[PDB]
Amino acid sequence: GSTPPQALQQLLQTLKSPSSPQQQQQVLQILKSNPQLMAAFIKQRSQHQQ
């Protein structure tokens, strides 16, 4: 049916990425658009229930 809007900003791709240092270098860029939410971004990775 229809897809959730939160799924977008959720960035399942990054959240579903390995803790490896390689992927970390890429995701690091995301921070550019994650100032204050920098902390809220972790909450979604630890718990993404709807």
What is 7-46 written as a DSSP string?
A: HHHHTHHHHTS-S-HHHHHHHGGGGGG-SGGGTHHHHHHH
**Technique used by the depositors:** NMR
With 0-12 / 13-18 / 19 or more C-beta atoms within 10 angstroms meaning exposed / middle / buried, residue 45 is middle
Q: How far is CA 39 from CA 1, 18, 34, in A?
A: 31, 19, 9
Instruction: Classify 1-50 by CATH class.
Output: mainly alpha
Q: How far apart are CA 21 and CA 18, in angstroms?
A: 8
Cβ atoms of 10 and 43 closer than 8 Å: no
Q: Where are the domains of the chain?
A: 1-50
